[PDB]
Amino acid sequence: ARKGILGTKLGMTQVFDESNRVVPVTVVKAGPNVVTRIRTPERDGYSAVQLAYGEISPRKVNKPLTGQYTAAGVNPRRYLAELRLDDSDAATEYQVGQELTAEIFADGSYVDVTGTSKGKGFAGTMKRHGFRGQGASHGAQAVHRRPGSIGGCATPARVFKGTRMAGRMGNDRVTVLNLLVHKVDAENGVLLIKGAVPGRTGGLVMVRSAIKR
Amino acid sequence: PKPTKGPRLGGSSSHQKAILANLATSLFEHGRITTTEPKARALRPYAEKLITHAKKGALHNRREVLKKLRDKDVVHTLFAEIGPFFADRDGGYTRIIKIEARKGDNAPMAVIELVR
Amino acid sequence: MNRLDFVDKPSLRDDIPAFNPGDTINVHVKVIEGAKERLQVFKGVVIRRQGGGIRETFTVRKESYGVGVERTFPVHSPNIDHIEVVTRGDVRRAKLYYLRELRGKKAKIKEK
Amino acid sequence: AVPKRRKSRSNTRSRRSQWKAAKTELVGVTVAGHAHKVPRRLLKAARLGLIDFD
Amino acid sequence: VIQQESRLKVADNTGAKEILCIRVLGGSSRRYAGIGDVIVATVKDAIPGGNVKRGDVVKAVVVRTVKERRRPDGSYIKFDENAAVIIKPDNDPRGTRIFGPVGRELREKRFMKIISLAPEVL
RNA sequence: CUCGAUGUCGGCUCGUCGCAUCCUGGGGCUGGAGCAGGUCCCAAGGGUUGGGCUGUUCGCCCAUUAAAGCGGCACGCGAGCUGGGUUUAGAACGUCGUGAGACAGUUCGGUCUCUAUCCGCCGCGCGCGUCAGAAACUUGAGGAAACCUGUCCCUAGUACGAGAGGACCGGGACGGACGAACCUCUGGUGCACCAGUUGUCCCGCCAGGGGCACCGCUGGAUAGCCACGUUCGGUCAGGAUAACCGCUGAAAGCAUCUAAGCGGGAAACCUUCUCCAAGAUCAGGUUUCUCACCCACUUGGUGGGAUAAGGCCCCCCGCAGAACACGGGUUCAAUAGGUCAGACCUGGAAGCUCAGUAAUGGGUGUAGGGAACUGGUGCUAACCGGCCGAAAACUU
RNA sequence: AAAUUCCUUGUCGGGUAAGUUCCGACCUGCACGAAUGGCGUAACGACUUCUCAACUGUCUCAACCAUAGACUCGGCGAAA
RNA sequence: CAGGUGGUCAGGUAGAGCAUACCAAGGCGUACGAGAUAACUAUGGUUAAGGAACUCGGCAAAAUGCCCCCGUAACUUCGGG
């Protein structure tokens, strides 16, 4: 009974609750969705449900992907992702063509939000893993942000696999756990989710109900 | 306009003001300038904001153009000829056409010009 | 207009007066001392606005007992009962941070 | 650092074969009744006489 | 925010005019002390003939901070000097009265005596 | 082994591993009433602070802490940094030497070179394979990361105890440190933003402006990037074991946790939670689209050509970025620019007029100027286009 | 207890919350001492050493911006 | 070839000045370019709260800075400081 929806992050704002405290929310347009495919265990090996989201022109979608929507009777959407269910009692409440909206979540419930983190480019070691660097004075020649040593000596004559180094950072699937739902606006299709939601302002966001509660 | 992301033209940030002022003096004088392509892309929002002050035509707009251009002969041809010629065109007063790159450094080149 | 204006619209407050930096202002703050819900008055010079609608703040500065205090309230906050403008001000800046280093007669904002 | 040993004929040809010029695409232009070939990024200036075809 | 070596002003009549932070009590390797945090400190300046002398290791609770503090309602409080009050080991001040205003963050940290002696609690 | 060179203490930076365990977790015994302990066994998952002195390692001291563990890795790490000490040349004191000079005796000064070929490692591509050519969603074989803990209240001043003192087990609230994501708030930055102002030159001059002086200096400062800021995380439930505790029960008419058989049992192990992952060559699964021609030869699972589905290149760009890749757009167009209007920053333009001998002040006017954020508008450039790309069979 | 003291961080006082260095003393001077000068000394020192006021990215603890490289394209084109 | 090379002339406006800033007469743009918000290095800039906690050591940076007028200690070789 793990519910889920696809959505678009719209930015952050603040709001005031009944105890006159300030709550930083992050607006997520949990938009209208549709099913388009049901993964049954006897046919596909697991239990899940696809979710299609986003307005798109019907000329921007190629013929292999258009026909996957014609088998379900749905107009083509932009995004398409799966909600992983448990290994039993697959689709007694999901049908093909069913419209899922934002009010499957209640006020005060918890959600787990997964998206793609923002990119930081080819980042050095003080930004990517949080090193310290050598000093800023007292003789330190040209090593103010350099990682220092990366290994031992003749034993072992190798850098170990998994040594933290510089490289790219961001564009990672990041799930943020146990976010409070302040308000679901069924008139606008908008969840007010307390806290931070990973992504640029407009990226794809999967909002699923929490398992840790 | 939109500031230059990354390093500026000609080295410093003060040379780029003088380059975009000299390239705007020469564009409004002749009507067509051959230059490098990253300078033609940078001239196109800068020079169209001076033509917008020409369409308004008041004294406060003339003082605002003289903050950038130092050639009074090209300020006069901007308010008596270039301004009223674009009196019925809502933006988009310039055009970039790409030219063959030049020998010696393979710098990509383009021409920037007024519309008609 | 912004993308998030249909969310802030039910949370805005009408009837908050027009005040600028340099204006001497009483602020009536809701205060909970246990279970009493009293009302405490803060009188001082508004020195700052940092706009944005629901996210707009303002900063008042008073001199309490030889010790300067600043408070940065949000506008449209339900812990402010009502704001009442006392004295209009005639300043030239908009952030007025030079008041953080003057004491006495040298920190007197004009009366226009 | 210096090279410790010289690279053999199979490692100095596998690297050197990857240093090569990329070819450009060419499209068709009929200006003044003479058909030529320019890249597509210069297709506008071919129709305006700004391209010297030598 | 107060870490080690921060010299604070003393806001009572015990005789000390200036203390100097040694630790920030309340956990291993704690870095910053806000309003209401207990400092083990040392007296670096004293009024002559006072109860306390120079070079005495005493405890003290911070009652003013120049750095802002986010209260849970969205508001902030900011002072123009850092101030402390030298205390007994049962959260009562050693002096008999307190100078200057103190913060309301002393109220939820069970420092009830310093509030009732303060000129103005904000 | 190394003298046709294996650069030596300590510190910084980054680690990794053993358990002879400092803390937390599980137990037996006790000269264990309780609270605290002593001692032994099991356990390496995480944590193990900041200062004074000294070149120091070590050590003493200060204030804390749940605790301030011991060790290996060329006493880890100088083609990563330092250079205080030892260990060149100068000089001095003490001592020894008739003297040149000497001293694990002291003191002051004393060049730390290098563009990464190969393995290793951290990232990102190009090619081919995966028995037709493509596109979208995926299972997880197997890996990675994470794993810390305190104070207070209730249970209860109950059990225990002459008293002082003071719980196990269960339940709840709030913190320290640490990590990730984000930019609403606070705060930092701001090199095409706004304003004040000094020297000087220039725009013919006055007015108004600009060039240069670190962005000339100074007060602000939206976006973006940030942390000192905000939000969340290490949870709960299972499986198989350690020490240890058992039940049934002989060989051994008794007894014994054991030889047959069965239980309880922890931060360790394995699932659970987050992430990567079919180059997992056993190269996987469910679906959808094209599902088609022509030529020559030595008639071959042969060579070419031309196409469908489809993608790439070029073009307009991006909060995606070293190149490359990735994401959005290409007139059936709001993709960047312009433009119009908001939001937001600055703080009251120029011109005119009024008041003053003047510097300057009031009015016209929430003015003028202006970048990133939001919506409208078909004005400018997204073109009148090139290059790749689809099948032998056969056996049961 | 020294530019001289091995034992040694001698002992006592001062300064610091904490002082093997520093200052003042004692004398048990391993191994001070009178022109290879003894003990002082105002002024002076890019000298050695210790404390304090002020100020600071030296540090807690790092963030951001511009520029010269690094990087990409075209030309020339080495070295150990 | 970012080094070295004796003498003469030496304008304006601010300034004590042959300093410094901007200019005259007169020279010059000095011989690889074009781009592009990577890490890292280099030369500069700014920084919340704390202010030597850094470190062998306040190394480096920051700070002080000019003219006029009041004011100025121990000690001394009577000049000074």
Ligand SMILES: [Mg+2]
């Ligand atoms: Mg970026």
Ligand SMILES: [Mg+2]
């Ligand atoms: Mg650092």
Ligand SMILES: [Mg+2]
């Ligand atoms: Mg160097």
Ligand SMILES: [Mg+2]
């Ligand atoms: Mg350096």
Ligand SMILES: [Mg+2]
């Ligand atoms: Mg920028």
Ligand SMILES: [Mg+2]
């Ligand atoms: Mg360059």
Ligand SMILES: [Mg+2]
């Ligand atoms: Mg400048």
Ligand SMILES: [Mg+2]
């Ligand atoms: Mg505002």
Ligand SMILES: [Mg+2]
């Ligand atoms: Mg050799």
Ligand SMILES: [Mg+2]
């Ligand atoms: Mg025991």
Ligand SMILES: [Mg+2]
């Ligand atoms: Mg063991």
Ligand SMILES: [Mg+2]
């Ligand atoms: Mg360990």
Ligand SMILES: [Mg+2]
């Ligand atoms: Mg585990």
Ligand SMILES: [Mg+2]
């Ligand atoms: Mg000290």
Ligand SMILES: [Mg+2]
């Ligand atoms: Mg170790």
Ligand SMILES: [Mg+2]
């Ligand atoms: Mg070693």
